[PDB]
Design a protein around this ligand. Structure first.
Ligand SMILES: NC(=O)c1ccc[n+]([C@@H]2O[C@H](COP(=O)([O-])OP(=O)(O)OC[C@H]3O[C@@H](n4cnc5c(N)ncnc54)[C@H](OP(=O)(O)O)[C@@H]3O)[C@@H](O)[C@H]2O)c1
Ligand SMILES: NC(=O)c1ccc[n+]([C@@H]2O[C@H](COP(=O)([O-])OP(=O)(O)OC[C@H]3O[C@@H](n4cnc5c(N)ncnc54)[C@H](OP(=O)(O)O)[C@@H]3O)[C@@H](O)[C@H]2O)c1
Ligand SMILES: N[C@@H](Cc1ccc(O)cc1)C(=O)O
Ligand SMILES: N[C@@H](Cc1ccc(O)cc1)C(=O)O
Lengths: 250, 249
C-alpha cells in the first residue's frame, strides 16, 4: 500500500505530512510556489519548481496542501490536461465545502476526489498522530483501492477516522475550530503573559495563544472567508461576551 | 495542630476543610445555610449561631464566604466576643478588598493573613501539589500561629508566593478574570464537543465545563471588587474587535 504521492504546496503543513509519509515508505514528489529544492534534497523528495513538470511525474495521488485562500489560484494555474493518467486528488484544507465545490468544477471528470481535514498539525501532533482526528469525505471515488491506501496513511498512525460530508464538517468546524482560533488570536492581540499566580485555566489559555499564533494569518482568514457558517459563530461569540459583560453591569 | 474555624462552609470552605482535617487540625464551621448533617458526616462541629462559633476555643478563623458577601458577613459577626486575639485568614479570590475591609472592621489585636489559593475543587481534586498559594502577611504579630497555617499549604506541595494584595489584584485581573470571562462566554455559547474536535477546542470545552461549576456570585466578585478588572475586560473586548476587523476587510 506504498504510494507515489505528489504534494502541491510544500509549506508548513505539506512538510509535516511528508515527514510521516516518508516514515511509512511512500515515494514523494513535491511542487510549490517557493523553492524547496534543498529541503526536498534532505528528505529524498523529488521537487519540481514548475507545476507543469510536476503533473507529468509518476504519481498515484496529488495532495493539495496550499492555503485555503490560494487554492483557486493554484488549481487554475495547473495544466490539468498534462495529467498522464486519471489521478486521485486529495485536499487537506481546513475548510471543506470550498475545495469540494472547486475541485468538482475544475478537475478532469475522471480524476477522483477525496476531501480531507487532519484535525491536527505541527503544534498538537509533534510526537505522533495517535488519537488525533482525521476527517474525510469521499466526494468522487471510483478506484477504491488507491483511496483506501491513502486513507490508511492516517489509520495506521492511530488517527480517529471520521467520515462526514464537507458541509457537516464546515458546520462543526465553524462552531469549534474557528471559535478556538478566534480566541487564540484574541489572546495573541492581548499579548497575555504568564504571572507568578497563574491558575491552571490561564496556563491553558497562554499555551492556546502560543500555539494559535504559530499559524499564518492566511490560514485564519481562510477559516472565516471560506466557511459559510463561520460568520454566525463569530456573531455568537460576540453576543455571548456581551451577555456576560452586561450581567456584570447589572 | 490548630483549632481552625471556617466561616462560609460552602463549596470552597468544604474543599479546604477536607485537607485541613487530614492534616490533623481541629475544624469547626459556621455559615448562613445549615450544614449540620454534612458536618456530622465529615466529623466536625457546626455552629448555627455565629455567636457560639466566636466564643469557642479557636486559633484561626478562615473567611470562606463569597467576595460579594464579605462585608455583610463581617458586619454581622459580634467580633468583640472573641475570647482572645485570633488570626483572621481570608481566602477570597480578590485581595485588596478583604485587606482594606478587615483592617477597618476587625479588632485591632486580631491578626490578618490575606491569601488566595489559586486552585479549587476543579483543578486540584487530587491534591494541591504544584498549585500556587498566594499570601500577604497584612498584620501579623503571632508569627508562630501564622507560620503554622501557612505550613498547611506548604506541606501539601503548593508553590508559595508572597506578594502584596495590590500586586495580586493587578495580576489576577490579567489572568484569572480573563480566563473566567472566557469560560463564562463559552458557557453562554453552550459550546459542544463534535466528532472533529481539535485538541485546542477540547481545552476550551473543558474550560467551559470547569468555569460553569463556580457561582455567578464568584465571577461577579472577581469584577466588582478588583479595581483592575474593568480595563482587562476592555483589553479583551478591544482585542476581539481588532481580530474581527482583520476578517471584515
Ligand atoms: N496545523 C496546520 O497548519 C494545518 C492543519 C490541517 C490543515 N491545514 C491546511 O493545510 C494547508 C497548508 O497550511 P499551512 O499550515 O502550511 O499554512 P498556509 O499559510 O495555510 O498555506 C501555506 C501554503 O500555501 C502556499 N501558498 C500560499 N499562498 C499561495 C499563493 N498565492 N500561490 C501559491 N501558493 C501559495 C504556500 O506556498 P509556498 O510555501 O511555496 O510559498 C504554502 O505551501 C492549508 O490549507 C491549511 O488550512 C493546516
Ligand atoms: N475554586 C474556588 O471555588 C475558589 C478558589 C479560591 C478561592 N475562592 C474564594 O472562596 C470563597 C468561597 O468560594 P465558593 O467557591 O465556595 O463560592 P462563593 O459563591 O463565592 O461563596 C459561597 C459562600 O459564600 C456564602 N455566602 C454567599 N452569600 C452570602 C451571604 N449574603 N451572606 C452570608 N453568606 C453568604 C455562602 O454561604 P452558605 O453556603 O451558608 O449559603 C457560601 O459559604 C470565595 O471568596 C472565593 O472567591 C474560591
Ligand atoms: N496548527 C495547530 C492548529 C490547527 C489544526 C488544524 C488546522 O486545520 C489548522 C490549525 C495544530 O497543530 O494543531
Ligand atoms: N474553581 C476552579 C477555578 C477557580 C480557581 C481559583 C479561584 O479563586 C476561583 C476559581 C478551580 O478549581 O480551579
Amino acid at each position: 500500500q506504498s504510494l507515489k504521492i505528489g504534494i502541491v504546496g510544500f509549506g508548513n503543513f505539506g512538510q509535516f505530512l511528508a515527514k510521516t509519509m516518508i516514515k511509512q515508505g511512500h515515494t514523494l514528489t513535491a511542487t510549490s510556489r517557493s523553492d524547496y529544492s534543498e529541503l526536498c534534497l534532505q528528505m529524498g523528495i523529488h521537487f519540481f519548481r514548475d507545476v507543469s513538470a510536476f503533473l507529468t511525474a509518476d504519481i498515484d495521488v496529488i495532495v493539495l496542501c496550499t492555503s485555503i485562500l490560494s487554492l483557486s489560484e493554484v488549481v487554475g494555474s495547473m495544466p490539468l490536461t498534462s495529467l498522464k493518467r486519471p489521478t486521485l486528488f486529495v485536499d487537506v484544507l481546513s475548510v471543506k465545502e470550498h475545495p469540494r465545490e472547486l475541485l468538482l468544477r475544475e478537475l478532469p471528470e475522471d480524476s477522483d476526489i477525496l476531501c480531507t481535514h487532519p484535525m491536527f498539525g505541527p503544534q498538537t501532533a509533534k510526537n505522533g498522530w495517535t488519537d488525533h482526528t482525521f476527517m474525510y469525505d469521499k466526494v468522487r471515488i471510483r478506484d477504491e483501492v488507491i483511496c483506501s491506501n491513502f486513507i490508511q496513511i492516517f489509520a495506521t498512525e492511530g488517527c480517529k477516522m471520521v467520515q462526514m460530508s464537507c458541509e457537516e464538517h464546515d458546520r462543526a468546524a465553524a462552531k469549534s475550530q474557528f471559535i478556538t482560533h478566534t480566541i487564540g488570536r484574541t489572546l495573541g492581540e492581548m499579548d497575555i503573559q504568564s504571572t507568578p499566580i497563574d491558575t491552571k485555566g490561564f496556563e491553558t489559555l497562554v499555551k492556546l495563544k502560543e500555539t494559535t499564533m504559530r499559524d499564518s494569518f492566511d490560514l485564519y482568514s481562510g477559516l472565516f472567508v471560506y466557511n459559510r457558517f463561520a460568520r454566525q459563530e463569530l456573531e455568537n461569540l460576540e453576543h455571548a461576551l456581551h451577555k456576560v459583560k452586561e450581567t456584570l453591569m447589572i
